[PDB]
């Protein structure tokens, strides 16, 4: 019983480890916005100006 | 320094205290106790080397998890009540009950007595009822302490 | 305070009430009963310290999980009907049936009687048929109560 | 109200009907049958309270899962053909075959006869061959019905 | 209609054919065979009702999975070679070898003979070596067929 | 006992590491994928110029 | 064509070669060996049909995984050193050691001798130490080869 | 080259040293030891070929995981204290204690003595208490070293 | 006054009317509905104060946007036809079809029934076809009404 | 009028015609379609009021955009050639190829058959090649038609 | 001065007042609140320096934006009615309803109670309906206040 | 005409030529290729009518964009050099290097071989270095050709 | 010169000072800090040439942006007050509060202690309340300093 | 000419030089590097054609952008000081610091060694501090070089 719950409870617990390691998607999205989103407004010196 | 030694689980003596008083909160009948201080690590890698440039600690917590088989009304009503209070019903407020935790354990051949103490352990959830047919109720707590306040040999 | 004591699962007595009446909804033959009040916790960290600055509670709920082996038509038809009604067929409306739950249990040596009561338990799904060859039908509920209304020693 | 009572799995009689006719589709040799009406729940929480403000139902379905050990050509060819048709080959069209389902079970001491009926059960996948060395072929269906059309005591 | 009947796994006869010729590709010694035609289901819900408005099929495939314990050089070299060719080495090209598959199986009391045929089965990966100490090499294939071309009683 | 601890420790490790193996290959998508603003929103070449 | 036949695992003879020399790298005491050529598949679907329009291969690799119980210093030092060199310590360079791999197995009744050969197998991680109380050290490699260079009957 | 040979787990001697001194930190009673140097691999594919164009290494680390059953105060207090210090309590600072690790094992027939040495091993979390009813406390460390500094036959 | 209360989206009933008749135009299957009365605000600053002196409303409209997943031929042909007419083709004239709009919702626990009514809603564009592979067609309207004619508790 | 009903995307049948012939231009493998008749709206105000006086349609067009995955040489060579001609190369002339477009979709429960037809659709740019690694080529057209010529239930 | 401290969002109490009365306007169920006093900055330079000479505040504003999930009829009717009146319909006049706003929060460890008060908040647009399938209606206000009238520790 | 057919991106073969010679410029390892002939469309409207009267092409070009992962020194030095010259450094002159471009693809089941050819493609910018930690360098070109010189089925 | 080294963010210590006193303004609980000296670059080209001839700096500023999670009443009341004054309400005057800013960070392995100091930082807007349900309040400042007064290694 | 080949990012070595000396400015720990020579293109049309007549390069630039994670005091102080000087504070002058830049990268299979060199790179802004909680400081430079001075195979 301590396996039967325990294994999948402990997998549940490393859902905790999965916090930052899934959040890595979000962080490396943002770290690409810094090279890909920034370029939308920057040329408005032309596109608007 | 002290020779490393086996530790026998059934020699442990876990206790909880209210951090407002240092007064004991009645708790008994443990079957498992895990205390694990942890930090998040971050590692630096750059184009200059395949090897690690640096490694650093940050987000510190003490993982406390306890399995126990004697129910305590005092522990449960302390948890419901929040800091410095006791309640018989869920409380609609933001402050979790913080417990001071201490565990004392002789080494298996009596070479030392390890005392571990943890401040401000909080438990996100409290099992109240844990009935399984043909078994005593058995309760699992998982919680996070702020820091280890003491890890020492407390033998004379 | 009252000494912590063992609790024996088969000593439990679970009941469900309609919160519109406090009238009992017939339910029997439990084999597992877990009641767990929980909160979401948020911990504050900043560059000031590796240690936790703060910790706070928010989303309160009471997880209720019940495994049982006697089918109740009243319980099932109450669940189909929503608040204040019974139905023989699925209802196309937004209100789930809210149940009040109480579990009473003597401690193993009779030191106390734990009463746990939970308001407004709802179950997202209801097992109707749970046939397995060579077994009695065994049904598992999983649901969320709003709060614990009572956790007390109810002995004389 | 009717007393809650045990139900013995091997007492159940499961049938499938074509909703165009109410005509039986031949099916036999069940081993497991689970029928579970379900809804998605949304819970409302705000800054006003740690407790739940509201809870509401939306996407209704009936989860049907059946494990069975007698193959039926009629059932398989009905599933291939889609609504109101039978086929010996996969059909390149958008409509799944919708089955009416009914399960009838006496209670263990004959206190009631529980009839469960489910409309428009559809199965995303159909096992045709399910050979394992030294075993009879065994088939698991998983599908979704639209609603429970009847849940009653059908005894005299 | 034909009465549903038990099917004995070891009575099955699985064959592979090259769709360019209808010529047999030598393959033997199966232990497990699963053939499962499937569709993706989309269900429609809107605020008009908690019940399902519609359900529809798309993305038809036939999941084929086979476990077998006699190695075939022809099957492996056909897979490496791609359509209409055999090779003794990986081929640097876009086209997977498509196999026609047929499984013929008498029912356990001889009431019928189920023939299942699947077109254009492709296997993303081929196990060549599958050595485990003290065991015969055992090979598992997972693949997707385009459609079931025949599901019929082929008995006289 | 062995089948308990010897499984559940691996649940701790693998429940986490599955999010590494997938998550890294997600960032190898993010940098191209949210990079795609460079070819979608950034290029005023598409008419604005 | 050649009749499919059983293969007995303990009849296998695995070898590794340095692709710079075709010189043997000493390796022994295998327990499990799996070699699996794979491609990524893409399936085309459109509004025209529920059936698959097309299916195509792309990223080819050969999954190699080996479990073995005799430690080789030569293999480990070749892995540390990268292409064309041994090393006693980790190297801060970008090139992994590429191994040619070959496995030769007689069929169980001697009908054929199956030779599998794989080019440029690389292993992301090398277990150096794999100690467990009361057991010999057992090592698992997982790696990817570029292609199968040979799959043939090499018997006379 | 040296013949590959079996290694018996119970023959190993594991030692931890402070990299500031090369002084030994008392550690004992190991049960499992896994040491695995690992690199991230990147593989290049383009439309030129289905085969891999290139493969490259980056992010070197050595995964170290140890299960042990004798508690060490020195090791625990070193971990708390960070580089060049011991502490009886959690320290609010950025720098993890880095350990040098060495494991020495004779091969089973004495053909070689394998020494594995790893620099700057850090452990994100330290188990202080690991009590289970009827068991000696058993501790599992998971950590990472910067590189393997030595892998050699150290026999005479 | 009436206590603020949660509103469950799915409890809503949107309806459209022809302002010439007050007759219903058949519309159904909504999934999102936003109704927003707005005015242009002039924020007026003065001679040498940094503070805002005055603020004035000047151009009223009601933003209406609706996402829905059941197509209506009547609604689309009314939109094509312009005021007081129905058409199967685009009309080369300057009058847009003006719809009266009403939405009615119970509050989540029955404290009130909110009715919102908007006059002369016009939609610049009408999505006729909105197909995506493996989806039901889903349609998004954006438009502007002249004013809110009613916003009240319409409960008994 | 006909009840509003869901529409399933994969039930659509898009076609293109040359307006000089009413002959079909071969086009297939659609994955998305949007057809949106649109006008600009001039909202106009009086001198004395914040409320809208009148609103007027101007500058009609039908936004057409299609995503598709089967390439057509005919469609591309028609686009290159301009009205009433095909070309294998860009043409230096000022008349674009104008396409008539029609899409036919059954409703999800067969309540109606929605036919949408658009005159003189022009595409400012034609995707000839649209390759992405490991994918079928997928083409997006955005263009504008003059008017909707037909929006009707074509069932009967 | 008072030590800086964490603030917990769910500890906040937001209130709106009619500036004609100082009477409360009923509002509840916030989920986000941002209050930001702002000025435009003119940065000014001399003829003979790259460095900034002076910088000046102008055009003061207090950005208020609130997300909330309990609808208020009083708040909406106050907004429609303008200063000192309520209306069930849009009003054709130039004066917007001005709200006084106050938010009160304890600091996380109770070190202070921050009160923020803002005068003459106006909202250019009011969401009346904000329905999404399977969600409670969530309402977003964006508006601008004239000044912060109070920012203080209001604890005893 | 030829049936529309799927095209598989990895079956493509892109080539660049110097228009002075028709000699190949070495280029390889593309991942994405998009070629799009385009015109400016003037959409002309008349007096009174809301409908479009005419639409006219002007100002033709071919948008070319390519992503590739194998660096070419020849291509880069041809771009630097300008027409009919090669350079290791930027040239201060007004003539861009003009490349003839051709791409060839079989259709996915061999129905046709589509050849697209474009004259005088020029690229405003050339990525020389495109490094990212743990990646192969990936280079994206955007450029414009004068016209499509060929779009035909070049199969036998 | 000093070797470049990693900097760990959490090792930083930010401080604010009043330029009238050099007194500290209480500020804490930082999460992000970016400091960026900038100039406008006039990037200049000649008649004859495509190459840049010259580039010149003009308007200088230091961009400062800080994200922080501990609210400071002093910092806020200083910002409200303007230079040399403190206020509980917005001030109708043109002088922004100017802060001297300093940040001190050790390098990751103690190579240097980087001190950055900035004169006359001003913030256009101050977030007072920044509440999100289930989160601590988090505040973002953006502002501009006049110049960097110091950038040095301040280590012993 | 040399075959095109993959380039691995981590194989690169970036360096900066003072153009007054050709002396190295210490810089390290890059993560991303992009170097892109660019021109503006004037696409010129003619009197009586839709086709492009000529196209011309103007306004040459080399975009340099670098992401790096090791701070350099020398690089930052060179930037502050302008040409031919270092400073610890902003300098009030109009000459920016101009850096020569060189990047050297081996090809992935050693086919060539690509050297890129750029003259007079200027950076409009210099990030000094770039702290983010739980991360090393990471710095982004965007700048513009005058021209590419070298692009060649520098291998022997």
Automatic annotation (TrEMBL), chains A, F:
Highest taxon above the source species: Viruses
UniProt-recorded name of the protein: Phate tail tape measure protein
Parent sequence residues shown: 245 to 293 of 341
TrEMBL record, chains B, C, D, E, G, H, I, J, K, L, M, N:
Domain of life: Viruses
Name the UniProt record assigns to this protein: Tail tube protein
């Amino acid at each position: 019983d301590a396996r039967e719950w325990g294994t999948n409870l402990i997998d549940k617990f490393t859902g905790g480890i999965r916090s930052k390691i899934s959040g890595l998607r979000n962080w490396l999205s943002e770290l690409r916005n810094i090279g890909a989103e920034v370029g939308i407004d920057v040329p408005t010196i032309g596109g608007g100006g | 320094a002290t020779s490393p030694e086996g530790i026998w689980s059934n020699s442990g003596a876990l206790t909880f205290e209210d951090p407002a008083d240092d007064s004991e909160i009645l708790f008994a009948g443990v079957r498992d106790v895990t205390i694990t201080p942890a930090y998040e690590h971050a590692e630096l890698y750059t184009i200059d080397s395949t090897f690690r440039d640096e490694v650093k600690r940050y987000e510190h917590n003490v993982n406390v998890e306890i399995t126990y088989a004697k129910f305590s009304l005092e522990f449960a009503q302390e948890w419901l009540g929040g800091p410095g209070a006791t309640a018989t019903a869920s409380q609609d407020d933001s402050d979790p009950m913080k417990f001071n935790l201490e565990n004392v354990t002789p080494s298996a051949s009596g070479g030392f007595e390890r005392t571990t103490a943890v401040e401000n352990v909080v438990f996100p959830e409290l099992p109240l009822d844990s009935a399984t047919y043909g078994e005593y109720e058995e309760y699992s707590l998982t919680g996070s302490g702020r820091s280890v306040t003491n890890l020492a040999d407390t033998s004379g």
